[PDB]
Amino acid sequence: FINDRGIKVLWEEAYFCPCLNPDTGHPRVDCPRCHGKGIAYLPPKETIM
C-alpha cells in the first residue's frame, strides 16, 4: 500500500555538526558539512513516502 500510494524521495538523517562553537554553542558560518545551519546530514537513502 505505502509503496503504491507513495512518491520516491531521498531520506537523509540529521546530526549536529562538530563545527559547533564549544563556548557559545552556535555554528560556524560556512563549512563543508553544513552551510551555516548548525545541523549536518548523512548520505541519502532512497525511500518511498
Binding site: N21, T24, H26, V29, D30, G36, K37
Partner: protein, 275 residues
C-alpha cells in the same frame, strides 16, 4: 530643506560598509573583544575583497524575498518637535545656497594670482585646508574660482589643496522659516545565526561612530543618540528562527523653508512739511 533621514542613512551606510568589509585589518580592529571562533567565521564569510557571501541593506516591507543570512533592515520610526525660535525664524540669507561641498583642487598660476578651480560656483567659502589668508594675499572669489596674490606666494604654484565651500543657486534673498525636529529611526540586523547578528551589530556601531565626522550630519543631524534592544527571535514560523537585535538611532534636524523677499530699497524721499 526637508530632511529624509532614511535615505541619508542608506547612502552613508552602503559605501562605508562596503569599504569597512573590504579589508581585514579594520575588521580585526573592530572585533578585538570577540572570541576567535566567531571572529574568524565572520571574516571567512563576509570579509575580504573576494568574499563569496555578501550583506545587504534595504527598507522594510519589500514585496520581494530578502536575504536573511545577513541584512540591515531600516524603518522610519517616530518623530517629535522639541524647540522653536521666535516667529519660527532660523536664519537669514542674502544669496540662495544649496548643499555644502568638499572638493580637491590643485593650485594654478594666473598672470596676477594663484587660483583654484571648482566644479560649481561659490556662494560662500568656509575653509581652505591649512591656509589662513592675510590682507596681503587679498583673498577674492569670482564665481567658480578663488584667487590670491601671485608674487609673494610663488613657491606654492602647485599646492595640492582641498576646499570646503557652498554652492550658489540664485542672487535672491529671503528668510528661513522652520523648527527643530527630534526624530527616532530604528535599525536592526537579521541573521538565522546569532553570532553573525552580534558581529553585524558591532560593525553597525562602529560605522555609526565613524559617521560623526561626516559633513552632512555635522551640519544637519547633530545630537546622535543610540539605544539597543534585546536579542529576540524575529520569526518562529520558519524551519529555523530569525534572530535580530533592534537599535534605535536619534537625530536632531531643522526642517525649514526659504521665504523669498521682493522688497529692495534703492531711493530715499526725505522732504519736509509746511503749515
Amino acid at each position: 530643506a526637508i530632511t529624509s533621514v532614511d535615505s541619508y542613512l542608506l547612502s552613508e551606510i552602503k559605501p562605508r560598509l562596503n569599504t569597512v568589509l573590504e579589508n581585514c585589518y579594520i575588521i580585526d580592529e573592530v572585533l578585538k573583544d570577540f572570541d576567535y571562533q566567531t571572529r574568524e567565521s565572520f571574516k571567512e564569510a563576509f570579509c575580504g575583497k573576494n568574499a563569496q557571501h555578501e550583506v545587504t541593506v534595504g527598507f522594510n516591507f519589500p514585496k520581494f524575498k530578502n536575504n536573511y543570512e545577513a541584512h540591515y533592515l531600516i524603518q522610519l520610526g517616530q518623530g517629535q518637535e522639541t524647540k522653536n525660535s521666535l516667529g519660527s525664524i532660523q536664519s537669514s540669507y542674502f544669496e540662495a545656497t544649496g548643499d555644502t561641498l568638499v572638493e580637491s583642487s590643485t593650485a594654478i598660476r594666473e598672470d596676477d594670482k594663484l587660483v583654484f578651480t571648482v566644479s560649481k560656483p561659490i556662494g560662500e567659502l568656509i575653509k581652505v585646508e591649512d591656509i589662513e589668508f592675510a590682507k596681503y594675499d587679498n583673498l577674492q572669489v569670482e564665481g567658480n574660482k578663488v584667487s590670491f596674490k601671485y608674487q609673494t606666494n610663488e613657491d606654492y604654484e602647485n599646492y595640492n589643496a582641498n576646499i570646503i565651500f557652498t554652492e550658489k543657486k540664485n542672487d535672491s534673498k529671503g528668510l528661513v522659516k522652520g523648527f527643530t525636529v527630534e526624530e527616532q529611526v530604528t535599525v536592526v540586523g537579521l541573521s538565522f545565526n546569532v553570532d553573525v547578528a552580534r558581529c553585524l551589530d558591532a560593525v553597525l556601531k562602529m560605522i555609526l561612530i565613524s559617521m560623526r565626522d561626516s559633513i552632512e550630519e555635522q551640519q544637519t543631524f547633530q545630537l546622535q543618540n543610540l539605544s539597543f534592544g534585546d536579542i529576540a527571535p524575529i520569526i518562529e514560523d520558519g524551519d529555523s528562527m530569525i534572530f535580530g537585535r533592534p537599535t534605535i538611532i536619534k537625530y536632531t534636524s531643522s526642517l525649514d523653508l526659504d521665504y523669498t523677499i521682493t522688497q529692495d530699497i534703492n531711493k530715499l524721499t526725505f522732504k519736509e512739511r509746511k503749515d
